[PDB]
Design a binder for this molecule. Structure first.
Ligand SMILES: CC(=O)N[C@@H]1[C@H]2O[C@]3(O[C@H]4[C@H](O)[C@@H](CO[C@@]5(OC[C@@H](O[C@H]1O)[C@H]2O)O[C@H](CO)[C@@H](O)[C@H](O)[C@H]5O)O[C@H](O)[C@@H]4NC(C)=O)O[C@H](CO)[C@H](O[C@H]1O[C@H](CO[C@@H]2O[C@@H](C)[C@H](O)[C@@H](O)[C@H]2O)[C@@H](O)[C@H](O)[C@H]1O)[C@H](O[C@@H]1O[C@H](CO)[C@@H](O)[C@H](O)[C@H]1NC(C)=O)[C@H]3O
Ligand SMILES: CC(=O)N[C@@H]1[C@H]2O[C@]3(O[C@H]4[C@H](O)[C@@H](CO[C@@]5(OC[C@@H](O[C@H]1O)[C@H]2O)O[C@H](CO)[C@@H](O)[C@H](O)[C@H]5O)O[C@H](O)[C@@H]4NC(C)=O)O[C@H](CO)[C@H](O[C@H]1O[C@H](CO[C@@H]2O[C@@H](C)[C@H](O)[C@@H](O)[C@H]2O)[C@@H](O)[C@H](O)[C@H]1O)[C@H](O[C@@H]1O[C@H](CO)[C@@H](O)[C@H](O)[C@H]1NC(C)=O)[C@H]3O
Ligand code: NA
Ligand code: NA
Ligand code: NA
Ligand code: NA
Ligand code: NA
Ligand code: NA
Ligand code: NA
Ligand code: NA
Ligand code: NA
Lengths: 596, 596, 596
């Protein structure tokens, strides 16, 4: 009996019944212990003696054996024990080798990481993906990963190692073709990686989530080509209540927190500091296989960010046989700033960027039905390169309502670069334009409409303080066609501006252009006593449907007209009043109106 | 000794002290095992031998025995083990039998569902409620359920069985008169049910929540009368970060994701696909016993939905002795579309519906202080039956600010049906009206004001592109009284519209109606050289307080007035200028204004 | 052998191998039991015999021994078992004694509270902090607490004891200088305390969170000086999805739910009932040591509240050597009401308060770049003391867009109290002003601008129903300077108001003041037949740049001007038309405009 009890089957001979309940199962101790499983149950030598983890022990084969075994019983949760650091020091074998994989995840096998998982110096200057849910080196030939959850209070530490070559890839968790998989509570830290977590593969997958995770210092070298902390490449998936922080200079130029690349995906309630970019919201044609060629129902909400480049980047593109489309997007409730930096020292600061494709093409995009509402954006006064929207590629629609934008430009695109075709750009009057950059705008147009064309668009400019340094509130170069559009500049804070709206090709004269803006106009009257006409000296008002006075009348003996219409020769005309006769000459501030 | 050790009391004779710590308790192994409990501890035959679960084993009595026992010790958490499917194959007995109950929940007894719970074919064509927290067949005589949490990565599978009769009810979890109860992480799938989860009973309960659950394919037949996935019938309760999906045709006509039926309830951060409706926000008088007759502090925020009918339905109603009231509601940050379907093939598409009671009555409602803000709504161009709001019952107030609505109608109610009494409907100018349905609106009014009366309301219409197909921007039939209201149509994109605002009963003449809209007006002048009057040929402008030109003047020799007032006979009059004399005749586009 | 097996080392001699897997570790039963730990492992007498908890057992030393031991092994999670109430009945010793501490938390040692922790009557009329993460009585000399998480379905019950003296402090969890610490799922109840949870210390700490907790009845006496349920005093931290309830009268006068006192902090998705205040958003100079002197990236979103005082209070202040600054704040998506109460029976009702410092100073604040958007606020009609914003201290900027405010005042400050200096106050026209207080406003100004000065501000007043009881829509006393500002009153619902905008110092005449509002004006014409001038009888319009008719013309034989300008003597003048000659005299409602 002593032999049996001291043997590995001993617990299988000690009887147990829950709480001495006579109605409970008559079990053995081993049965109850078998209800849970930990890395300790596989972390042993060939004789079955436990091995202590440590920097000189490679725990990989043992964790893999645990996963393989639990998988074979239909699943369960393997605990990675608290109070220990478990080092990984070799590559996995088989289907994950094509992904530089360390551990292969399996369906229905959850990992409760309570301790620490650390990469050993074997991985220095090498590629790696720590956990991989693909089962084949070719993702198109891979099976699915289902019902795999990684959670706990533990840590994945990437060892601080730099990339060896820019062409290498590194990742924390690649769920693969992933259905009902998640990471919750985990801290990913101290690395130079491409991604921390990737969900899905080219639209294959569903219901994958990253929640309450921390991502700290995951870019550290000039070799790192690019970094996006979470890449969401399956629909009905997203990122919620996470924390993302970088301290490296390199991160300010290369790092983004999230990629939302399939329909019905979201990024909410998260805090970002030290990154270049917040989130891309994109449909890549090359990623359209599993869920279609449309990214729709895309949500970026209630995030807090300090970034150095752009908050949300919108795009779509094409391959030889597939066209990507982006539509039905909402960006709301976010509070975002460009961190302290010199002008032009990081990628151009923006709340929204309409980004050209990876080859720089600006004529492949199909982006529409986007609502940007209830956000606040701030950039310090010295940051010349800061805009509410950098509109750098073709845009089929974007709507701004009730935001507060406090930066250098509202709408911007650089002259002599791309010439976007713009449709359905709507900037509602409820967007509040801050004053941080007042007096910084010499030579600059607040809305700098450097486009090929603008149609079906609305720009309602409302200032909230004076900035007499700017060249204009809104400027259209002669190369920009403008039609079926409404462009207004409210008069408040504009009395002393030389230029308010500027149409360098006289585009405001278009049949279906609806415009109003302030201007200074010189008038002269006829001599007649009584009701008497006043006429503008200049003849550039053939497009004006009505105008009205924004100036007081300092005179007693006469008054100019309150309101004006035009004449065929381009003069304004109105009827004033001469109490006493005489030719009058006045300079008046008018609101010029066309069809409004 | 061998006898004792091999007996069910054996573990109670093997000593243990935590980590050989001399300061720790000297325990027995059974004491430590007794800290946890699983279904295995009760899933046994009358001799105490464990029984394997499977499709031919009814696990119900064993799970019930586990719950009953743990309850008797003041509570705890019972694990339903991973790697097994536990089938239920009979009805429960006692107080839950009146609810077609399977398992009776008890207070302080949590269920950690890691494996799968599946209904056996016993339940085919039958009613059932899988988990029931009532302790009496009459809910009014039931005790409370407190501190009961169901959570884990597991699954409740309803076996795919159709309803046997439309009058049957099916549910997953009915917490009952439930205080501090929740479901977290669970997947409910593969059924034809009435509800997945119900919280509370007629206002009795508090602090009940559904979080991070999935609801997949829970309607599958034409027999199913109605489906709402979660019914929230207790205050201080709600649904967060859930996923709801249906694939059946029937679901598009009958299924809603959530009912919010008591005060201080919420629905946030969730994704819905394949349903008829998003959420009802309702006070039923028949449900007012536990928490009063007011549903207030109701929140529907930051959800993503593809539906076929209406997103949010508002209502309240009465019984013989109780009147229900709905107020203090916020609907914000949601992105919603009507999915691809033929016009009129599902219930009328809407973002907000003001829904008549279950008997069709439209004169029992008391709905006010609702804020709908920062949402986006889209319906494909062919969907005639799509509206920002279908206003089908009496409304005491609803406020729309800063939404983007891209569908056929803005405000709609069908003529020849109900005649709501409308008060305090506010449609702010910051609502952006999309252009998807441009050119589809022959014979249709964008705001079709088919009401008995409208008072204290604001409609500020702002187009963002042309749609010359529509009959009018806004139309009031002669049967609709209109008073103490502001109705404006911005001129942008309206120059070529025959009708902008239409008042078929000349209601715009009311003493406290404030209106402005564009119109085309024919004028003739007197012969006089110099300042000269122009008068309208028609006499239907007795209500106009001022008008101004929206047209250019192609003439050199004269100009019509910039601005006009009226005369007692209903003509417009203004003072223009004849450089040379002559009777003039012009047709001008004017902004007509009344009291604005 | 029997001796060994019955001894505390017995489990260390019974062999086990997971699921009889020949590839698994050959362990002993004690090894597997050692993977978990509970209070039972330390809750024993000096001979190692287990002690049952209860109201006459002080569990403190045992829980402390458990924490101290697990800490020494590098951490883990200690379960506090379900089905038992564990009483605490003495103070801790050492570093926590200076904090009236009971239990000392240690790094990496989590507490899974499943049962109940209750304070014994030892603590009646005494100070206490139940769990303390400081390790020194002087916080400036304390070490850090890291990686400490408290979670579960359990309860902390404060025994209902009143404070003994107002100067005492009581707390539930003081994490201290806390990095990666959290409380999740716990119910804190039945107390008279200062705080339930405090995060951080004077800016030291990071990544601390309170999620899914309940706070119920934590103020019960007149002795309690002040209460804030969660104080967030470290950056990158916040409160999400919590429930806060009070029933005591005292709570309505003293209690706030949250303090956000460091940068990158948030309060979201929570429900509050019975409190005085929602949240303070503040930078105290005295708290600036660990994270700097700026509170920025502050977020209060998507909360539901019934309160009696103010929802969000903004402030910053100074010490002898440090100045605090508050900027980059967003308050969005909240639905808030003042609960039923008599006027003036609790602190002044407000959605936003700009609060003077703790000494009452209103000239130390530096608050700017605040966005308040998409919120709804309601106060019952009798509550005179209710305002969208009580602006009681110096303000450098606050922006309101797309809110719905239904209360007595929009902007308020009490006359004869503080005289704030106001800059960059922006009230967009998209704010909807409710009608609950219509007819209650005798003697009152809707926007009561009781300030020293206002600059760079925008107030666009838009009514949505009539209230002829109010004295004015907006009033500036003569003591308030006004410059570089835009003040407009839309005409809708204003026709019968005697006063719309009132400038008691004629401030609207300022060179850079842009204003428009309705007024009634008496005019007389000259006798001349034909085009004929009309002039105002009064001479107080020297500041008017244009005016236009808001009245119809009941006359046939003449018409007054549609539009007017002014003259040097302060008369309005315009050109009307006398079909037949005669001196005319009319009273007209005009929109008066200055520079707009
Ligand atoms: C499936 C569902 O919940 N449908 C919703 C309707 O519920 C009733 O619920 C329907 C609601 O009335 C409407 C609200 O819109 C209408 O909109 C609300 C209706 O929406 C359906 O989605 C609900 O009434 O009214 C609005 C206000 O006037 C108006 O604006 C709008 O335009 C209208 O359309 O929304 C849904 O459609 C609701 N439907 C569902 C499926 O939730 O109809 C239900 C049909 O299933 C259900 O009635 C049945 O069940 C009750 C309850 O069953 C008894 O009690 C329980 C406790 C025991 O366990 C059972 O064994 C049984 O004894 C039966 O009495 C009734 O005869 C059945 O037809 C809804 O009942 C409520 O169910 C909840 C959840 O279980 C209970 O907590 C609550 O006590 C029940 N309320 C009442 C009054 O009985 C019923 O409200
Ligand atoms: C109960 C509470 O937190 N009240 C809030 C006030 O806190 C002080 O906190 C109050 C805040 O000052 C005000 C802010 O609004 C006012 O608004 C802020 C005040 O709001 C109360 O709600 C807080 O100061 O100032 C604004 C800015 O100028 C202005 O806009 C506004 O109009 C003003 O009204 O908000 C609340 O009212 C705060 N009150 C509460 C209860 O949080 O007052 C507190 C009273 O309890 C408290 O002071 C006491 O406690 C400190 C701390 O105790 C020592 O240190 C700790 C670490 C040890 O454990 C203890 O044993 C003890 O040695 C005592 O020094 C002091 O003498 C007591 O009166 C607040 O102190 C801060 O407590 C937090 C949380 O524990 C600490 O992390 C922090 O270090 C403390 N800060 C300071 C400067 O001591 C105090 O700020
Ligand atoms: Na590869
Ligand atoms: Na890139
Ligand atoms: Na990137
Ligand atoms: Na029943
Ligand atoms: Na129904
Ligand atoms: Na329904
Ligand atoms: Na102290
Ligand atoms: Na205080
Ligand atoms: Na307080």
């Amino acid at each position: 009996f002593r032999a049996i009890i001291e043997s590995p089957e001993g617990a299988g001979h000690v009887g147990y019944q829950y709480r001495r309940n006579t109605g409970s199962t008559m079990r053995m101790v081993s049965d109850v212990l078998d209800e849970r499983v930990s890395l300790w149950d596989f972390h042993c030598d060939p004789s079955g003696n436990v091995i202590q983890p440590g920097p000189n022990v490679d725990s990989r084969q043992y964790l893999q054996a645990a996963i393989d075994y639990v998988s074979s019983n239909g699943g369960g949760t393997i605990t990675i024990p608290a109070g220990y650091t478990w080092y990984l020091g070799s590559y996995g074998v088989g289907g994950i080798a094509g992904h530089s994989g360390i551990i292969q995840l399996r369906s229905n096998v959850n990992l409760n990481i309570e301790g620490r998982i650390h990469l050993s110096p074997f991985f220095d200057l090498k590629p790696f993906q720590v956990f991989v849910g693909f089962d084949n080196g070719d993702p198109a030939s891979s099976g699915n990963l289902e019902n795999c959850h990684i959670y706990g209070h533990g840590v994945v530490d990437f060892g601080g190692y730099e990339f060896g070559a820019s062409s290498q890839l590194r990742n924390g968790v690649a769920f693969g073709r992933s259905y009902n998989c998640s990471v919750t509570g985990i801290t990913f830290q101290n690395g130079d990686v491409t991604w921390a977590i990737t969900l899905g593969w080219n639209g294959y997958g569903s219901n994958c989530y990253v929640r309450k995770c921390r991502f700290i210092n995951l870019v550290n070298s000039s070799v790192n080509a690019d970094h996006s902390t979470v890449y969401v490449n399956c629909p009905y998936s997203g990122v919620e209540s996470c924390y993302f922080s970088m301290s490296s200079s390199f991160a300010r130029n290369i790092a983004c927190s999230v990629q939302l690349h399939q329909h019905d995906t979201f990024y909410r309630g998260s805090t970002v500091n030290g990154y270049c970019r917040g989130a891309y919201v994109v449909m890549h044609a090359a990623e359209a296989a599993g869920a279609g060629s449309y990214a729709y129902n895309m949500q970026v909400e209630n995030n807090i960010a300090v970034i150095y480049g752009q908050f949300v980047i919108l795009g779509s593109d094409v391959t030889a046989t597939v066209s990507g489309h982006l539509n039905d997007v909402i960006v709301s409730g976010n509070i975002v700033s460009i961190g302290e930096r010199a002008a032009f020292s990081a990628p151009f600061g923006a709340f929204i960027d309409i980004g050209p494709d990876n080859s720089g093409a600006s004529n492949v995009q199909d982006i529409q039905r986007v609502l940007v509402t209830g956000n606040s954006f701030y950039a310090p006064a010295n940051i010349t390169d800061s805009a509410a929207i950098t509109l750098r590629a073709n845009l089929n629609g974007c709507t701004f309502i009730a935001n507060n934008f406090d930066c250098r430009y509202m709408v911007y695109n650089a002259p002599g670069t791309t010439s976007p075709v713009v449709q359905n750009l709507v900037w509602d009057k409820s967007n509040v334009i801050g004053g941080t950059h007042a007096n910084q705008r010499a030579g600059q147009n607040l809305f700098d409409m450097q486009f090929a064309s603008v149609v079906n668009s609305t720009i309602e400019v409302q200032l909230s303080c004076e900035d007499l340094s700017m060249f204009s509130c809104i400027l259209f170069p002669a190369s920009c066609q403008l039609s079926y559009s409404k462009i207004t500049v409210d008069s408040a804070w504009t009395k002393s501006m030389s230029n308010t709206a500027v149409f360098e090709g006289n585009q405001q004269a278009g049949a279906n252009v609806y415009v109003s803006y302030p201007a200074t106009v010189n008038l002269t009257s006829y001599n007649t006593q009584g009701a008497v006409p006043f006429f503008s000296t200049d003849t550039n008002y053939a497009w004006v449907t009505s105008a009205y006075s924004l100036s007081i009348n300092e005179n007693l003996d006469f008054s100019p007209p309150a309101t004006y219409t035009n004449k065929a020769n381009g003069q304004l005309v109105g009827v004033g009043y001469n109490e006493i006769g005489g030719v009058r000459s006045v300079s008046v501030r008018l609101m010029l109106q066309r069809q409004v």
